Amino acid sequence: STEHVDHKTIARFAEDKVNLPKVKADDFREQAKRLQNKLEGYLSDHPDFSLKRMIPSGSLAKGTALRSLNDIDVAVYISGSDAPQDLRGLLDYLADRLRKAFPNFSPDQVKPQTYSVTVSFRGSGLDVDIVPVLYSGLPDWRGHLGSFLETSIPLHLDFIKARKRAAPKHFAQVVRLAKYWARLMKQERPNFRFKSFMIELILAKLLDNGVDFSNYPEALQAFFSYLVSTELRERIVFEDNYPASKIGTLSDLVQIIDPVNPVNNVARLYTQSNVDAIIDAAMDAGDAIDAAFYAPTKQLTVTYWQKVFGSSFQG
Amino acid sequence: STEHVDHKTIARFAEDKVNLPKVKADDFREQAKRLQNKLEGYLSDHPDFSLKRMIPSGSLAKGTALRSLNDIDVAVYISGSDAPQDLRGLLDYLADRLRKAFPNFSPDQVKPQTYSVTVSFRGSGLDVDIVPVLYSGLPDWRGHLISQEDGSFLETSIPLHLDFIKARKRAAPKHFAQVVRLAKYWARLMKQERPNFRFKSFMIELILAKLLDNGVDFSNYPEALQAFFSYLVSTELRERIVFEDNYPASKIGTLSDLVQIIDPVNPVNNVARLYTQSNVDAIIDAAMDAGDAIDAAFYAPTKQLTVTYWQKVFGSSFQG
Amino acid sequence: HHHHHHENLYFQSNATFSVTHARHMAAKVATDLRRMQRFYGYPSDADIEAYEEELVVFLKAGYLGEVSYGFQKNNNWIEPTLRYTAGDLLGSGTDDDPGKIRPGKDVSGASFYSFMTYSSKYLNATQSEKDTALKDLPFKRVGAQSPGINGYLENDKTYSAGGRSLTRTSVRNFV
Amino acid sequence: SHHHHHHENLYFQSNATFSVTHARHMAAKVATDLRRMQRFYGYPSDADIEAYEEELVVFLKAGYLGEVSYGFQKNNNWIEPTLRYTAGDLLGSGTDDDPGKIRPGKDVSGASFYSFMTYSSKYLNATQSEKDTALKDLPFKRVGAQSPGINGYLENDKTYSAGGRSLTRTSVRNFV
């Protein structure tokens, strides 16, 4: 019951086992700042250089990183006609440009990948995952990422900032608890997929709708109850950057709409099989959390919460 | 259990309560025969007369009548071009020709009905129910029968129908007709008890004829009834029933009707064409209850329980 | 808002379970098994007689906890499988007529099995008490693992006699 | 060949004495099921759930519970969702499932929430004095009412077990 595990138990567990420690997050941010400072310095000496900006872009920049972070997400804005429009070529272009701006590193440290270029340092901290963004001068650092997908890292970061401002600490913490749970489900369940961004937008919609995030068991239950009862068939649109009129008609089963790009459906790829998996998992987790609320002993309460958070949870 | 109610019990209940006693059946045949002989004599004197023949056509003619038989079925074959087309005029015309041929009868005793004409006998007699058949001289008295369900014209042969039944009785003397009668008795009880329940007697006979053709054993009545109920429940009346007595199954054209039990005389005449899903559901639920009861009675530990189970099938007339 | 069963509606004060009551329950299980036979080919009349016999012995002694009869495909019960669980008679007491076995289900590759779990009274009885109670058994069972269920369980009948009940659950295909 | 019984060594202890701790273990799982019903159908409330749990503990401890149903009822008939718990003896390995698996998205518009209890034979045989001592702590008292029916079928989907005893859960399911 709550005597055995309550909101403060979950909050302690999140710090001990879920959240990225501040010390480590500082280290990663300084790593990215180092590259960014080098790029700014090189850009200053060579205004015609293609790489115009490097922006931390992922969970670390949004304050939603988990202890299991394995690289630092950054976006690099690329301008000019020389840059290719094919991902293999563009990543090659990005790599060569990164090599030019970083003369202290050897060429082999900068290695391209399928969707990004990775900057790795041997034996000294995490790698830097760089995603190219084609830039043509649109406002708010809008750019395109096999067609071109428009995006703005600053606006994406702004969107999350507003929700964190609405519920300081609690929003980012619940997002991390839900992501931590989703990661456990993927290793335990085969067809299970749940994009981190969808989790973030679903929870942002709940926060906008007035759900209270200051009690983590109940906030998670609102999240799980939403998934089960809407069955991911309720369209999620935010009016931060455009009115809901802009979306138009969609044929997609799940509709969770990019708050920066009204034409991008984040859940576009998700099938009915993916949905049934999320729903089943959410029902099980909701069943476990309510079981823990009434469980007569600490041992049963912990065992129920371990259905949600895994063996690392000990109450 | 079988020690309390077995085949012999059912056979005895059939004689006591289900079957039409022979003395009554002989009286009814003589009633029909008297009209038939009077028509034969009249037609002999008046060869141009419209009414060409009267054939006993129902359960009495087939040996499948119940004690509850309420009238005597005969078919009257009507030729010529004087008969009007519409149902009301035809039945009025038939009434008129019947009075001409039986001038001794009080005219009021000949009464058109919905799809037939009634002939009433004043003293100690059932009515004779005359179904018209439009006739043009074809073999085997083939003609267009007027359906007693909706008055539609059904091209068929009542003599060949009587032949069809007689061949099944030959294949199982006594037992086939007895099981038909037990199943009709059941169906009659269901129609009183259940709201949407219909089950035409000729359909019951055709279903049982198919089971017999398929090798079902009719010599034990509990098991023969179980085969009938089991068939209804497991096919749900969606298995097409076709006989090859008079034509090959290749002559059957595709049909969309929900229940398809094809007239052994006419390959395009579906005897069950009018049965709806609600009808079918009523039959199936009833057959399932009946089968559950009969097998319950097979193991029931006491005579009282056994009789109670069988009364689900045959009603309060069944006492063990 | 909060209700309970009427006192009058409850059962007769004193009921001592006897072999008569056992035969009343077992006859209804036997009926169910013959309904299964008619739509699925098994089990046979002779087998049903033995199953009824066994049920009467175990019921009389109070040794039956639960028994299942039906088809198994792979290593799980499929429809049709009938499960009877011994319990105390409750409230007014429901003593249903036997039957209601659905036809038409797929038993293509399947084989018929029966599986019994004994009661806590069986387990607490001495081997001397067990042997006298199970003297009239028509056959003996061998230990086996409890098989799974492919489908869900429908609680669809209750048979009752002498202060005791048999609750029937039926395996159903997933739909 | 095809006649099997549960493995002898797989049977759990058959000499368990049912105590209040076993009662609380079963009643906590019912409370959970009730809270799951509330999340998807709005009833019963947290306070009612707490009182149902207290009631369940008292009746289970005394051995006076035969069967109890909670859920939505139209006319005199249960509809989905309705959870029914029948007390019985623990069998075999003694299945002790986790609570949960309430089906969401069912139409309950016409019905109101109710609960209905049937007492056990031990209760009916108990003296008045035995009842008074065993049931002193009841959070409320029940009044007789006509037994309700079921609009749908019953699915046996969970078993909760403790102290040699089991609770068998059937869930009402709509015809579909």
Ligand SMILES: Nc1ncnc2c1ncn2[C@@H]1O[C@H](COP(=O)(O)O)[C@@H](O)[C@H]1O
């Ligand atoms: N649908 C039908 N098609 C052809 N003949 C029928 C039909 N229904 C009844 N009959 C005839 O009416 C006779 C008696 O029917 P019943 O009164 O059902 O015993 C049958 O033996 C057939 O000759």
Ligand SMILES: [Cl-]
């Ligand atoms: Cl990141």
Ligand SMILES: [Cl-]
């Ligand atoms: Cl007749």
Ligand SMILES: [Mg+2]
């Ligand atoms: Mg990354």
Ligand SMILES: [Mg+2]
């Ligand atoms: Mg008639």
